[PDB]
Amino acid sequence: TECSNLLLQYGSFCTQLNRALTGIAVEQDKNTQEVFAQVKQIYKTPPIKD
Amino acid sequence: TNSFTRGVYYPDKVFRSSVLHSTQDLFLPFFSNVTWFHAIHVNPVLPFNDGVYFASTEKSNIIRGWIFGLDSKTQSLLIVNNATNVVIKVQFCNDPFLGVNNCTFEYVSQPKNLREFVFKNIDGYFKIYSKHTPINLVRDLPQGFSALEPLVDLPIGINITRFQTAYYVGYLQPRTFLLKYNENGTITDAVDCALDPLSETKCTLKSFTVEKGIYQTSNFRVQPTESIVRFPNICPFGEVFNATRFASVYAWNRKRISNCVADYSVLYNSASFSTFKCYGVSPTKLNDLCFTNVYADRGDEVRQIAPGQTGKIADYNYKLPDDFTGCVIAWNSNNLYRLFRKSNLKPFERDISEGFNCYFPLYGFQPTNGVVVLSFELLATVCGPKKSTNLVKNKCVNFNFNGLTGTGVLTESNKKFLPFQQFGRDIADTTDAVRDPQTLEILDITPCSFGGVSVITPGTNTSNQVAVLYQDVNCTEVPVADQLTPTWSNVFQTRAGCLIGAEHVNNSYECDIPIGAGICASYQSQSIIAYTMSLGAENSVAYSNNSIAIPTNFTISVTTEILPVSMTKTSVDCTMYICGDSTECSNLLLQYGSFCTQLNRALTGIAVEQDKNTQEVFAQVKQIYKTPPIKDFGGFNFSQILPDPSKPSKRSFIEDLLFNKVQKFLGLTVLPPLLTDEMIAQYTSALLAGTITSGWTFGAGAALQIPFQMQMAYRFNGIGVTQNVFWENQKLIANQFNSAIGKIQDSLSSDASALGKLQDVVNQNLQALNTLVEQLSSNFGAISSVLNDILSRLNPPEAEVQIDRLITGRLQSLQTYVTQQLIRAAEIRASANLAATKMSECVLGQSKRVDFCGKGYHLMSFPQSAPHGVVFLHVTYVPAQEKNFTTAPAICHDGKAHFPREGVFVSNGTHWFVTQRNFYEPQIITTDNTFVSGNCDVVIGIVNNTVYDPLQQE
Amino acid sequence: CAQKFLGLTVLPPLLTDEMIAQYTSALLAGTITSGWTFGAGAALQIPFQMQMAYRFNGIGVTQNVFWENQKLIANQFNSAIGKIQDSLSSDASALGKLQDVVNQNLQALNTLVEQLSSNFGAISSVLNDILSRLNPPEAEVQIDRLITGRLQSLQTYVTQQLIRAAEIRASANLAATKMSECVLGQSKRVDFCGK
Amino acid sequence: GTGVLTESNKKFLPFQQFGRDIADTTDAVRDPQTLEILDITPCSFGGVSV
Amino acid sequence: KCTLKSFTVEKGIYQTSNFRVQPTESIVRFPNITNLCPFGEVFNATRFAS
Amino acid sequence: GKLQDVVNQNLQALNTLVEQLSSNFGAISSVLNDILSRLNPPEAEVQIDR
């Protein structure tokens, strides 16, 4: 605890860090969704590949 | 004891208005249980704590005077709090209420209800806050806001309180919380932290209103509850540290004994023996810390303890390293030599082996004048005795392996500790495993569980319900170390997290509040619902070797794609950010290798770049096309997108709607855009006109001139729609376009959903500044966060240290800001070159890029300006009303395969015709509309039909 | 114990390998069913062989070039996919950039993790033991300097992770472009879709 | 500090001697010697572009 | 020229200096306490012993 | 200029590092040698750490 109270002396350090990291995390999901989850439909691969 | 009675008060805080501020001032959480009332009717009250809050009713005084305060012994106040001279006394007639060593410290005379004397504590003295007493609550507990501060601090010093006197008492906890100050700086309903996870989110985001989303709330840990300080325990040390023998100049021992159990140099802890100095350790942690050195080792100069000092220790006397750990004690009243040494000494060197004839010889026992250190190792132990509980399995404790303090569970000694049988390290940290000092057969490899907490918030404008997920969790159970309110409350046992849940749905739906891991949530009889994220809708259309779907009709859809172009570019002048109005630190500004100048240089670079981004995105012209005064272009009501009417100074209607959506002396400034919103609107005009009047305004030299219907004719022709509908469907294409603009005007301009992506930059930029300025309110280890206070409080030789500490902190934060912005500038540059590319190939021409310039087959895009960005209305062609026709590539009987020139040999079961992938619009095979190479070939797909040659002409 | 307790964890992707594979299935299925005729979701069904004829015609050869060579073309295709099945095996190129990205991040943490042990000018780095050894008053260096050091290491980590993210975002933007132009579309661009 | 003193446009509760801004820099001070509070604006400042 | 350490400066606008406004007065505001602080009762006390 | 600006910023980035060395960072002097010449034994660690 003592070091956490001392870390708080570096005011709101991690709030900024956590936000940046979270921003990266949503950006990653945004990238996946944007890259391949591009379809509003899921066409099912035909059972007969003729 | 419910209804969320708000334990709020102004915590001696400066008046602030229109703000949201967080603190930890021991407020009253809404946890009240029972209170002491209804004593009499038609039973003494003695509740006590330091962390208390009192509230009650009124008829006269009711409390027979409000009191606070043992009995007639010490520090007894029993303040009357009545009209007749309230005094701070420190027990006879006041024992009962009045009516039906008397040393005083202070005099104040400060003077159904809701009288509150709440929030008490000492702070070395006294603390008390008080609230108004409304008389129209028509209930027992008022929805209130806060208590005020008449005067709180007085010379009381009560270590404990138990005095009072239809009654209410609450008890305080040192919790963090959020206080909302309205425009009049009145604290409105506050939000406790750890009251509930939604409140945790509100604290987390330092914002009461919380949009629907997954917010990462504070982490969670199980509490270590016990500790081990175990060692076999029980040497001369405890007695021989003192020695009559005094020969230390030619002697500094280190190991009088290798193993001590009698180690308690209280001589230092209480200074029961003499003066001392400890290096690297507390003087009091003598049985908490242990070293493998138990003994060691005078002169008028104890100044020569000298861990790297410039004394006689350098060459004659005993030397210690600058990086020395240990503790030294001295002796006096006591009534070998420090002769000259030609060589220098090394740390911990013990050398007791040219100045004419004076180098070889080498004290005085008479009272010439009234004119000893133990080194500490870094390690196991064998000193500083201590004992505790036995090994604790399956629950987490502190002090794992005694000499170290860990929070791991003491289980599973599945490690051999082969060479030494004592200690293990992790792949990534000092401590991984231990062998218990007394029973060397058991281990600590399981640190008390810990992880992050994500919270699902449905959006506070709809619901106050939440779901919570421990990011890494067994999904077997959740401990109670925190809200502490719910049970562990059927919850989806997902790896994403599982503490308190949501209906775990066996059905599937569109994604919302995406927790991640293929799991989404919503509030849809309102409750949190957790779903397995579904995919897009199933498409089951059959395909065959001869089945082709061909549109018979079409629509024009307008995709509104909004891209950031520029940042809310700023310039931080560190002279103020760090040193505003501070002249003492002025020397420090110069101290740097222009680091500040370089940080500002980076932001200036960013700003110039931002102007360049706007310039590429909008300024690709030399002569601007003035929108012709027509409103006559195929009837397309471009009047809705062009800045023609001059109602606003320059803006178009769509851009008006875009601009209708979407902080002083901060030490920084937000530089004006080079091109104002008015100029951008005018460049927008320059592009839209020209775009609808000539075409390639840049690429084709103002694009000569086009009737506009010829233009979109050619654009259809570009997308692959040739000689099909651009002329046949005049008044239909125009109508669909028009309707699409209506679709944007009442949809995104009413929501700003798609439009909020612009703010992904603006919000972040503001947050970045908000972070930066908020970062100022930080001590960084300095005595105070306020530089001017350091200057007003500390002298030069002492202030500079803390000034520099604060400066270093602020410089680290500023570098962080510059860096964050340099990277965001790069990202926006990437979006800006995308936007410029899109303006160039979507607006200044017809891009063949599929699903790039909007959804579907882009034929056109009409840009509009947005604050720090561009919105492209990409008018795209979409096929519609598809019919499943039979296809084949070829026919014969003419001795010619006759493959379709550009079309498809398609039939409705008969009437084999040829058309394209644009519209049904069937046509007779028409030899001139086919391509022949191969005749009656072995090629797959001949349908044995015939085609008329227009030149048969018989 | 590859991933230990350092506060450094991984949040699962929204789109899990099942979800990614599932979307990929849709994408391929759309490719073999509408090819390019999509109103960004509004697929128009075409027979695959016919789609190939149209794509071939879109590249400057006639539809009959494909049809005359239907057997050739389809058979060359089958051989080519087999070639890739083998050429992507035997750890070829370590699957290129994908390995690199993961390597770019695991190391990002091995570095961050290593920094945990740095003393930052202090005697030690084991903060819990530092507090045990000395009292907070005597911790301007023992704790706060250490904290500052870790602060910088984390800030460096996020900074580099943001750069990594920016780079990744650009890669993803290009990948998305390919996803909508190269697949679910016919690129007319040289080396956009490979040589 | 340094700044422009002006009559505030808002009365503040008597319990505090001074107020603070969003940037946590002093917003206003009640005069210890007078029954008034004066907004304090940081003295005009900014960059110089040549 | 100094900001860029070059005697010849390219045509353009440069972020050169820092504009702050010089204060025109020194304003001292303290409560009008006329009671000399009884430090003598603290430091010239007859008995500190206890 | 496009291709000059890049080399420029790269070199400038180097130029900056050179300038940075000149900083004392709050130290008694700017060069390790001076530190090593003035307060070496007792405070080299402190000044050097700075």
Residue numbers in the entry:
A (entry chain B): 747 to 796
B (entry chain A): 29 to 70, 81 to 107, 110 to 130, 134 to 143, 164 to 174, 187 to 240, 264 to 332, 336 to 398, ...
C (entry chain B): 851 to 1045
D (entry chain C): 548 to 597
E (entry chain C): 300 to 349
F (entry chain C): 946 to 995
Source paper text:
Notably, the spike designs enhanced the protein expression of their base construct (S-2P) by approximately 17-fold. Furthermore, the 3D classification performed on the spike cryo-EM images also confirmed the prefusion integrity, with particles displaying one receptor binding domain (RBD) in the up conformation. Solving the structure at a resolution of 3.7 Å revealed that the S2 subunit, the only part engineered, closely matched the computational model, with an RMSD of only 1.345 Å (377 Cα atoms). Finally, the Spk-M design achieved stabilization through four substitutions filling cavities and five substitutions increasing polar interactions at the S2 subunit, including three interprotomer contacts. While most of the designed substitutions stabilized the prefusion state, the mutations N175R in R-1b, L130D in M-104, and T941D in Spk-M were additionally predicted to have a significant destabilizing effect in the postfusion conformation. In the postfusion conformation, these residues are situated within the hallmark six-helix bundle, where charged and unsatisfied polar amino acids are highly unfavored and can potentially disrupt the core. Given the requirement for a solved prefusion structure, our hMPV F and SARS-CoV-2 S designs were based on pre-stabilized constructs. In the cases of our R-1b and Spk-M designs, which introduced only two surface-exposed changes each (N175R and N380K in R-1b and T941D and P1143Q in Spk-M), this may not pose a problem, as confirmed by the RSV vaccination study.
